[PDB]
């Protein structure tokens, strides 16, 4: 049989979301980035609805719900593309209709940042990571996202604890060969945080370089 929370999370799991790249637009750095920002914006929304289903999370203040999200959003987005990519070699499935290999990562100026995410893929590939472990890990990454603005610390710890319990319980039932599997899982978050932080930086970093609002005017003009 299964753990109740884990079960709850598998049904809580949102449907696939497609990138829907514009085919009329010519392939370039800014296209890639344009496409990923739209995608993210839409996934954010379903990630926000998704969190409501996490047991405990609705019972927090609205301020606390917001804080955890503001801290863990990029971590969830990445853990997403990472799970979607497990079955693939050197490729990142941002969505079924948008898949980046070494060549395209180069076009988009994402080579360094994509390899870091591929470093996360490699590890979870090695531990034959499962959907049950993916969904619960997203919940934990959100509960344990270490925001400075928390109103109710006890309440947030209690959510970490319950989610942790669900993981341990699942590993006890499903992976008795490895009594350290749960901890091993937990030992991959430091990379998720590090990598998340790179993603976040790189972004505010290319808002300054503003070559996207350039490229848009070049598109309009040249046609």
């Amino acid at each position: 049989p299964y753990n109740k929370i884990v079960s709850h999370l598998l049904v809580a799991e949102p449907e696939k979301i497609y990138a829907m790249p514009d085919p009329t637009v010519p392939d370039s750095d800014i296209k890639a980035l344009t496409t990923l920002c739209d995608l993210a914006d839409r996934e954010l929304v379903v990630i926000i609805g998704w969190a409501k289903h996490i047991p405990g999370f609705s019972t927090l203040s609205l301020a606390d719900q917001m804080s955890l999200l503001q801290s863990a959003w990029m971590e969830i987005l990445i853990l997403g593309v990472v799970y979607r990519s497990l079955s693939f070699e050197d490729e990142l499935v941002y969505a079924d209709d948008y898949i980046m290999d070494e060549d395209q990562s180069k076009l988009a100026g994402l080579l360094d940042l994509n390899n870091a995410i591929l470093q996360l893929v490699k590890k979870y590939k090695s531990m034959k990571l499962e959907k049950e472990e993916f969904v619960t890990l997203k919940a934990i990454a959100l509960a344990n996202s270490d925001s400075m603005h928390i109103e109710d610390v006890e309440a947030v710890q209690k959510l970490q604890d319950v989610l942790h319990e669900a993981l341990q319980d699942y590993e006890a039932g499903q992976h008795m060969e490895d009594p350290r599997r749960a901890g091993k899982m937990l030992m991959t978050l430091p990379l998720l945080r590090q990598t998340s932080t790179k993603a976040v930086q790189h972004f505010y970093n290319i808002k300054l370089e503003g070559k996207v609002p350039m490229h848009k005017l070049f598109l309009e003009m040249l046609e």
Partner: peptide, 12 residues
């Protein structure tokens, strides 16, 4: 607005 978006959602 990252904050904006999140707020907008938890409203709707």
């Amino acid at each position: 607005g990252l904050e904006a978006i999140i707020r907008k959602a938890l409203m709707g």
